[PDB]
């Protein structure tokens, strides 16, 4: 009896993330794409590369 | 302090059946409310339901 | 509509009972977490969660003592 | 809409025993640093901070007695 | 009156026991509260608080103990 | 994949909350050993390492008390 | 990412209430030490470093005693 | 071949396959820690991963024992 | 063929290959120092060694510990 | 089989909530809408406002 498996594969994942904020005044506070509260010293952004 | 309230449901419920045969409907539905702050995340609900 | 039990009549009068001590503590342990170190959040926090370890300890005690008061009588049908 | 327990209320005797003294230390400690090397203001951050101090002791460990307390009737019902 | 079973009497034996502990407590840290730095409330509060808890205690045990009796006894009917 | 239990989730709360305690914590101690002396860089290490000291004692105390509180429900199925 | 906790806080207070010290004295310092054995100088110096004493001393001093608070009600959790 | 599994086979297989990569996690975990003890950081994370694990084992007995007893009590009757 | 080792056994002896050879370094620093007790570089080793050895000691026997336990509640649920 | 559902809602609320309570020289505390008065020391009413 012959049993034959045969397997074949290709995977690609290239791109960024982006979210941060930003305090101004101290009186009004904005953010971007943050699903959580921030501490409030502002101009702090992440850009998360895959290749 | 003075309030007043005012409230109002109407409901439908429709069945086909042949002559003689007995039968049943059946049904149930929740209803969902956004609680005030959204940053606190949560929900308030209800089920009605109907036989 | 779904079918619950005795026991799960005399459970839930604890959960209707203590009415919102389970979000209570959820916030009050995110509060803490942002600044560990604050009097006020920590003399917060050591009440609720006291009230919580009491809570679902005189819950489940209880459904157990029903459980044996029942499975005693079901033993006589026999 | 609060909930509040048995140690909650215990413990909230304290802070409505004490009326004031969670804004006074702030406030001496405020003043204090613009001119750390008065005696006067030295002497009267001095009292403050100890009767703060104390304050907090003491209503921990009263918290901590009950929790103990309760945790030992619940025990016996099983 | 309402029905009382043996237990009943058992436990009431103690709270009619100790006549005003239940209620001295609870003074002693109203006044505690007022002024938590003074030496002869302190005094007077750590001795309050620990005869509530060695009474607690004691009823609960003996209460069980009761209930341990009784079921063995009534197991053997059968 | 990165299996998380609930402990594992109440753990990770003050590893977020504590943004970059532990990153400073290391950097004030990679500067203040070239220079000891420097009471500017004394003081700020003070302060860091009183923060992480706290941090590390709340985290583990809570996690102890959650256990608890499962293993107790767990033993009444039977 | 500049996270800072209570004590930071408390610290931080103090170093922002002294507006200028820290420079004042690097001032005088080098005037002092340039032309030594200037009364004029010397008047002004040992005031500026005096009051710099104080002002370490105290700062730590205040941590020291908010660090042994929080601690001891940390105990208190388990 | 297969292992013929019953049913109490099946209510533990459930556990096994809930925690997916636990078991393996609580190794790894104890192999850096005892390589560098003193550090707070594999510590930390240790004693939850312990935990869990002990959580787990437990649940998973104390249940398999009671559908034995109902199991048994049902058959009882037969006779 | 070797002394036969348990499941307890094959995990206390991780630590011990874990601490490849502290063992000796605490020895050997306690009789250099003791060769000449005032001396601060000596002081300042020992110290660090002898923290070293209580900390691994000690964790040591705690998870042996757990690890009873664990079984224990295992063993019970066969009767 | 067709099987259709449909759903539309409308939400919306307006307005401000009074309440708050002031130490009036050591000789009255005085509160409005409080349904067990905490009487906060010193003085600050608050108005809550949503829409």
Chains 1, 10 share one sequence.
């Not at chain 3, 509060?31 to 809570?55: C, M, R, V, W």
Request: net charge negative; glycine share 4%; proline share 3%.
């Amino acid at each position: 009896l012959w049993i034959v498996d045969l397997n074949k594969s290709d995977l690609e994942r290239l791109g960024t993330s982006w979210s941060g904020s930003i305090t101004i005044g101290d009186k009004l506070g904005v953010s971007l794409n943050q699903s959580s509260i921030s501490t409030l010293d502002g101009s702090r952004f992440i850009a998360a590369v895959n290749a | 302090l003075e309030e007043k309230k005012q409230a109002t449901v109407v409901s439908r419920p429709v069945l086909l059946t042949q002559e003689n045969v007995p039968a049943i409907f059946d049904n149930n539905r929740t209803f969902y409310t956004k609680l005030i702050g959204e940053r606190n995340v949560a929900l308030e609900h209800v089920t009605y339901g109907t036989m | 509509t779904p079918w619950s039990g005795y026991l799960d009549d005399v459970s839930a009068k604890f959960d209707t009972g203590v009415d919102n001590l389970q979000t209570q503590v959820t916030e009050a342990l995110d509060k803490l977490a942002a600044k560990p170190s604050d009097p006020a959040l920590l003399a917060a926090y050591q009440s609720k969660l006291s009230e919580y370890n009491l809570y679902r300890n005189a819950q489940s005690n209880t459904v157990k003592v029903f459980k044996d008061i029942d499975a005693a009588i079901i033993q006589n049908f026999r």
